[PDB]
């Protein structure tokens, strides 16, 4: 309980008061109840300012005229800091021990865990065949990949992403691809594929742990680097049997051979592209900010036609311009115009604060802000050794941004759990807008949304593209929430408005605007 977290509540309204404070007896008795150096102080200074600048009067009159040893102090001190009043209560609410309890159906079941080690398409096959299955995808692509494959290859696939939810069945279908966040924990499945189990992400590990411990499957297929094995070995508290099946690199490796250039700067991508079209030849570009369409159409054109930074970790058949140092976890001839050290095995999986935990922390500490509540939660939290609490840094920011909009805990919880890029001014602006009108009970229709986003103009230089992509993002935000707060009614319509923009973007993406330089 680092008290730096506890902001004092302003409880607005001389001889012995000074002595009472100095007295190492009172100082110790204070510390006994939880009052440290800073707490005992702030408590006294407002206890003094309260008495003088304004029941107790009986004992007040009776110490004036001749003990001097505290409970009236502590009554004040506890309306200053309500923490102290419920320390024991908060600890229990943030006890995140024996996580495998939180999903009892996974415990109710016989589950076989199978781990396809190696630095894929077997598991993919094993659930196509499976009577009832599920995919759990890391990105918002690999989910679509399997959505397109399965339903076509003759095993219908539903899609549950954050931003899309599609039912193929003209009537709930019996197979679904999803982002690991969206994967059920109550729906009985037969085989489940948790792709990319590395659960180690300091901000996203939570959803993996969730999937690992909670999927109501009968076979649980993992696919991820052999460094992760140690962890799943003990994850055995749930009492299931681990099976490893190491795979290997078909061919290994440590110029412009028709080659892949990988940067770390969006400056370098807006540079190298220059370099290439200087010597006539024509380059592709894949930055993570590229709409999902223009990503594909720029990857497929490289896969008929005569790679330029985003960690490439879809199907792409194929040099570091910069090494800045590097996470020593990047994968792939690849020159430096790396495996120097061994990969440290993985230690702990990831948990995060729930809504409901925080809604309880709210009832205890009702004056605290979200940002602060989560900081308070994290403090009292209790993790078993093979788990860690995720970094809720984005969760907070999103909360410091909408703090003034008069929402309610639950709603406010969801809004700040929406995936935004801070470094995009228009998105943040937009979050506030979306949040502000909800409070005003002002449903955000296709009309409203059309005027707000301004049917955009074809891009010219690399600011317009940036704006357009943010205008893309803004639309994705509207969709993300459309599935949580929908009363955001014109969800389907926006996807259409979004779908042209994707091309209006692609248009400009082939024709790179990177020369900005001229003007």
Binding status of residue 239 toward a copy of itself by CB under 8 A: yes
- CA angle at 474 for the pair 405 and 391, rounded to the nearest 5°: 70
Tally Cβ neighbours within 10 Å of residue 353: 22
Stretch binding a copy of itself (CB under 8 A), from 138-146, 169-177, 289-297, 357-365: 357-365
Shortest reach from residue 310's CB to a copy of itself, in Å: 20
Cα–Cα distance, 322 to 337 (Å, whole number): 7
- 133-137 and 191-195: which strand pairing? parallel
**Do 151 and 86 touch, CB atoms closer than 8 A?**
no
Binding status of residue 515 toward a copy of itself by CB under 8 A: no
Cα–Cα distance, 426 to 456 (Å, whole number): 15
Binding status of residue 362 toward a copy of itself by CB under 8 A: yes
Stretch binding a copy of itself (CB under 8 A), from 60-68, 202-210, 211-219, 356-364: 356-364
Cα–Cα distance, 311 to 324 (Å, whole number): 13
Binding status of residue 404 toward a copy of itself by CB under 8 A: yes
Q: Which is nearer to a copy of itself, 70 or 426 (CB)?
A: 426
Binding status of residue 8 toward a copy of itself by CB under 8 A: yes
> Reduced to 3 states, what is the DSSP secondary structure of residue 43?
helix
**Buried (b) or exposed (e) across 262-296, using 16+ Cβ within 10 A?**
bbbeeebbbbbbeebeeeeeebbbbbebbbbbbbb
Binding status of residue 378 toward a copy of itself by CB under 8 A: no
293 labeled part of a ligand binding site: no
Q: Which of 432, 456, 466, 493 binds a copy of itself (CB under 8 A)?
A: 432
Q: Which is nearer to a copy of itself, 104 or 252 (CB)?
A: 104
Stretch binding a copy of itself (CB under 8 A), from 45-53, 177-185, 222-230, 318-326: 45-53
Tally Cβ neighbours within 10 Å of residue 192: 28
Shortest reach from residue 168's CB to a copy of itself, in Å: 30
Q: Could you give the string, one character per residue 169-208, with x where binding to a copy of itself holds by CB under 8 A and - elsewhere?
A: ----------------------------------------
Cα–Cα distance, 112 to 287 (Å, whole number): 38
Binding status of residue 49 toward a copy of itself by CB under 8 A: yes
Binding status of residue 60 toward a copy of itself by CB under 8 A: no
Q: How many chain residues are in contact with a copy of itself, going by CB under 8 A?
A: 48
Stretch binding a copy of itself (CB under 8 A), from 40-48, 187-195, 338-346, 465-473: 40-48
- 387-389 and 133-137: which strand pairing? unpaired
Binding status of residue 45 toward a copy of itself by CB under 8 A: yes
> For residue 222, what are the β-bridge partners?
115, 194
Binding status of residue 156 toward a copy of itself by CB under 8 A: no
> Reduced to 3 states, what is the DSSP secondary structure of residue 120?
coil
**Do 382 and 96 touch, CB atoms closer than 8 A?**
yes
Instruction: Give me 12's structure tokens.
Output: 């607005």
Binding status of residue 85 toward a copy of itself by CB under 8 A: yes
Report CA torsion sign: 212, 196, 394, 234: positive
What's the Rg (C-alpha) of the chain? 28
Q: Which of 425, 486, 511, 515 binds a copy of itself (CB under 8 A)?
A: 425
Binding status of residue 104 toward a copy of itself by CB under 8 A: yes
Cα–Cα distance, 169 to 161 (Å, whole number): 17
Report CA torsion sign: 456, 458, 464, 467: positive
Tally Cβ neighbours within 10 Å of residue 53: 8
Site for a copy of itself in 287-346 (CB under 8 A): none
Shortest reach from residue 25's CB to a copy of itself, in Å: 18
Binding status of residue 71 toward a copy of itself by CB under 8 A: no
445 labeled part of a ligand binding site: no
385 labeled part of a ligand binding site: no
**Residue located via tokens 């993002």:** 473
Binding status of residue 89 toward a copy of itself by CB under 8 A: yes
Instruction: Give me 182's structure tokens.
Output: 């969206």
Residues that bind a copy of itself (CB under 8 A): 4, 7-8, 10, 37-38, 41-42, 45-46, 48-49, 55, 79, 85-86, 88-89, 92-93, 98, 104, 107-110, 239, 267, 362-364, 366, 401, 404-406, 408-409, 425-426, 428-429, 432, 436, 441, 447, 451, 463
Binding residues: 118-120
Binding residues for ATP: 118-120
């Amino acid at each position: 309980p680092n008290t730096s977290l506890f902001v004092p509540l302003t409880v607005k309204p001389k001889k012995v008061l000074d002595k009472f404070y100095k007295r190492k007896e009172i100082q110790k008795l204070g510390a006994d109840y939880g009052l440290d150096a800073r707490l005992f102080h702030q408590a006294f200074i407002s206890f003094r300012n309260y008495i003088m600048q304004s029941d107790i009067h009986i004992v007040l009159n009776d110490i004036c005229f001749g003990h001097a040893d505290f409970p009236f102090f502590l009554r004040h001190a506890k309306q200053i800091f309500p923490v102290l009043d419920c320390k024991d209560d908060l600890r229990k609410i943030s006890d995140l021990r024996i996580p495998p309890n939180w999903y009892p159906d996974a415990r109710a079941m016989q589950r076989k865990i199978i781990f396809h080690s190696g630095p894929t398409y077997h598991a993919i096959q094993k659930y196509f065949s499976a009577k009832s299955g599920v995919y759990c995808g890391p990105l918002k692509l690999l989910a679509h990949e399997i959505f397109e494959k399965s339903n076509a290859a003759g095993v219908p696939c539903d899609l549950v992403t954050g931003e899309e939810r599609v039912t193929v069945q003209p009537n709930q279908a019996s197979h679904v691809s999803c982002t690991v966040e969206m994967c059920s924990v109550t729906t009985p499945y037969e085989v489940a594929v948790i792709d990319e189990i590395q659960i180690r992400d300091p901000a996203r590990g939570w959803a993996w742990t969730r999937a690992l411990l909670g999927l109501c499957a009968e076979e649980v297929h993992l696919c991820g680097e052999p460094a992760a094995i140690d962890l799943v070995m003990e994850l055995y508290t749930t009492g299931e049997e681990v099976e490893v099946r190491d795979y290997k690199r078909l061919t290994p490796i440590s110029n412009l051979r028709p080659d892949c250039i990988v940067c770390f700067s969006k400056n370098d991508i807006y540079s190298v592209s220059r370099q290439i079209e200087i010597r006539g030849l024509e380059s592709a570009v894949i930055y993570g900010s590229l709409p999902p369409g223009t990503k594909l159409a720029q990857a497929k054109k490289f896969n008929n036609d005569p790679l330029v930074t985003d960690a490439i970790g879809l199907n792409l058949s194929i040099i570091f311009y910069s090494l800045i140092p590097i996470t020593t976890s990047q994968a792939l001839e690849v020159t430096t115009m790396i495996l120097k050290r061994p990969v440290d095995p993985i230690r702990a999986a990831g948990l995060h604060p729930t809504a409901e935990q925080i809604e309880m922390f709210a009832y205890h500490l009702p004056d605290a802000t979200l940002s602060n509540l989560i900081d308070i939660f994290v403090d009292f939290s209790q993790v078993d050794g093979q788990y860690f609490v995720c970094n809720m840094d984005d969760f907070k920011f999103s909360a410091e941004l909408i703090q003034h909009i008069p929402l309610s805990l639950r709603v406010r919880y969801v809004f700040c759990t929406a995936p935004i890029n801070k470094k995009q001014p228009f998105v943040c602006s937009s979050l506030l807008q979306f949040a502000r009108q909800y409070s005003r009970n002002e449903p955000l229709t296709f009309a409203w949304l059309r005027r707000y986003i301004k049917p955009l103009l074809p891009p010219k230089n690399i600011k317009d593209l940036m704006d357009l992509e943010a205008v893309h993002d803004v639309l994705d935000l509207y969709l993300w929430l459309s599935y949580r707060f929908m009363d955001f009614p014109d969800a389907s319509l926006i996807r259409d408005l979004q779908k042209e923009l994707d091309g209006i973007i692609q248009d400009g993406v082939h024709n790179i605007l990177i020369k900005s330089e001229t003007h």
